[PDB]
Amino acid sequence: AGILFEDIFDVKDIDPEGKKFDRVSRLHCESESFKMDLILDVNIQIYPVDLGDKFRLVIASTLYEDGTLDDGEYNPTDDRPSRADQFEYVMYGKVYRIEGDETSTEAATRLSAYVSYGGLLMRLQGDANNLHGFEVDSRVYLLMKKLAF
Amino acid sequence: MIIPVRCFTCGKIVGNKWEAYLGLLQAEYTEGDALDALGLKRYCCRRMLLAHVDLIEKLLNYAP
Amino acid sequence: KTALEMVQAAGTDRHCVTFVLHEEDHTLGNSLRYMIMKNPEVEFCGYTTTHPSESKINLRIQTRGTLPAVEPFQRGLNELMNVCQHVLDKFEASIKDYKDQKASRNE
Amino acid sequence: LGECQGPVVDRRCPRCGHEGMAYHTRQMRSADEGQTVFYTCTNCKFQEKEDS
Amino acid sequence: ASRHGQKGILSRLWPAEDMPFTESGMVPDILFNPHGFPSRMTIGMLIESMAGKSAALHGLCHD
Numbered sequence: 298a299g300i301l302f303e304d305i306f307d308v309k310d311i312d313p314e315g316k317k318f319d320r321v322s323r324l325h326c327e328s329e330s331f332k333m334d335l336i337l338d339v340n341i342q343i344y345p346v347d348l349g350d351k352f353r354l355v356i357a358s359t360l361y362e363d364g365t366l367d368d369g370e371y372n373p374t375d376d377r378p379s380r381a382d383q384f385e386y387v388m389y390g391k392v393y394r395i396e397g398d399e400t401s402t403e404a405a406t407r408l409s410a411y412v413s414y415g416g417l418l419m420r421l422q423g424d425a426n427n428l429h430g431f432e433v434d435s436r437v438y439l440l441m442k443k444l445a446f
Numbered sequence: 447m448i449i450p451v452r453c454f455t456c457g458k459i460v461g462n463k464w465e466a467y468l469g470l471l472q473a474e475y476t477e478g479d480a481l482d483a484l485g486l487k488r489y490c491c492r493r494m495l496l497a498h499v500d501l502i503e504k505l506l507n508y509a510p
Numbered sequence: 511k512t513a514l515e516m517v518q519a520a521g522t523d524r525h526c527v528t529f530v531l532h533e534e535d536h537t538l539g540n541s542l543r544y545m546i547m548k549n550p551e552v553e554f555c556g557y558t559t560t561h562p563s564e565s566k567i568n569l570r571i572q573t574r575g576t577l578p579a580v581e582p583f584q585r586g587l588n589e590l591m592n593v594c595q596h597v598l599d600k601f602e603a604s605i606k607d608y609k610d611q612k613a614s615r616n617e
Numbered sequence: 618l619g620e621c622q623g624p625v626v627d628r629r630c631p632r633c634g635h636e637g638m639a640y641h642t643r644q645m646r647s648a649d650e651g652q653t654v655f656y657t658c659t660n661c662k663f664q665e666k667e668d669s
Numbered sequence: 670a671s672r673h674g675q676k677g678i679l680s681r682l683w684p685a686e687d688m689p690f691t692e693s694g695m696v697p698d699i700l701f702n703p704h705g706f707p708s709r710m711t712i713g714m715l716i717e718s719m720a721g722k723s724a725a726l727h728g729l730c731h732d
């Protein structure tokens with residue numbers, strides 16, 4: 298598995314800063330199995346999210362779940378049955394900053410991850426033990442799917 | 447000077463609707479009903495016949 | 511006197527070729543672009559008019575998976591002819607079914 | 618015997634970064650085009666112009 | 670020009686099939702740039718446009 302991150306989130310607030318871009322909602326979240334926050338932009342025409350909706354989140358490096366291969370090129374005419382698309386909303390973009398509150402130490406216990414999915418941003422702040430595979434200019438996938446309970 | 451054969455915007459023959467528009471305004475129609483009843487439905491066609499100063503009945507007075 | 515030129519990528523690459531279609535405009539090159547993009551052996555099909563004072567279109571057809579770009583171009587031409595012949599047939603068969611109800615209703 | 622330099626507009630100054638500058642309009646080109654707006658800050662008194 | 674002091678120069682005679690036709694069937698006749706307005710502030714060309722459109726649609730002449 299090339300799963301760089303996997304957790305269950307719960308939306309607590311939608312666009313608190315009040316910028317309101319068209320077709321795009323900002324979703325502040327908190328986690329359940331980790332101690333993390335999440336500030337994600339979605340597309341709200343296609344995959345609508347309201348406040349109070351739990352959904353699983355997976356950031357992976359490759360979509361081929363049979364071995365880490367990391368092709369890069371998008372082929373619509375080829376479909377393999379080993380994609381990680383059992384989820385519903387799939388984005389793609391590269392990590393552009395990671396930052397933390399180090400005080401003359403390495404990889405302090407509150408590390409961030411700034412992913413730019415073609416324009417839609419993301420901030421996944423949390424422990425440094427949960428954000429190992431984020432290197433700068435690493436092209437990661439986003440995979441989410443709405444839970445209902 | 448004289449009515450154009452075609453409307454400028456879309457090429458509808460409006461050049462045959464000048465005498466049968468004076469004939470409707472002499473027979474007591476309003477101009478909002480003398481243009482619909484000639485079959486001019488778009489406001490580029492109506493424009494050509496509503497706002498037309500037929501300046502050849504004033505220019506033929508100076509005739510040999 | 512001919513009205514199609516083909517301009518290769520490097521004189522050797524035959525996947526990318528930019529077809530220069532003389533005496534056309536966005537009437538054909540927007541509907542060719544619609545048909546060739548329905549071919550899954552095409553990475554990229556787009557068109558541009560060279561300059562509006564001129565009378566030709568550039569048509570970039572860029573094929574993946576080892577095909578020359580003459581085959582998606584020919585398939586997209588025949589596959590537009592086979593749209594227009596069928597549109598012509600269902601249009602000449604609904605004008606006729608309209609004249610055969612305007613006439614044979616009360617007359 | 619013996620203006621606060623005009624009305625303010627929320628525009629960030631180039632030098633000191635104050636949020637509000639005072640402006641004055643004046644029509645310096647021909648009648649074919651334009652106005653001309655002269656901004657003037659409150660704190661550092663900096664004056665730049667724009668041509669519309 | 671117009672009657673609101675807004676000169677244009679004729680730049681390109683655009684063929685009619687390329688014009689943006691409307692939902693009523695109409696092509697336009699002159700295309701005017703939205704970047705001639707904010708430095709010139711001719712609100713009067715907007716009201717004249719609404720006014721002449723509504724006068725050509727009713728047989729009226731508007732004051």
Ligand SMILES: [Zn+2]
Pocket residue numbers: 453454455456457458488490491492
């Ligand atoms: Zn017309």
Ligand SMILES: [Zn+2]
Pocket residue numbers: 630631632633634635658659660661662663
């Ligand atoms: Zn200042």
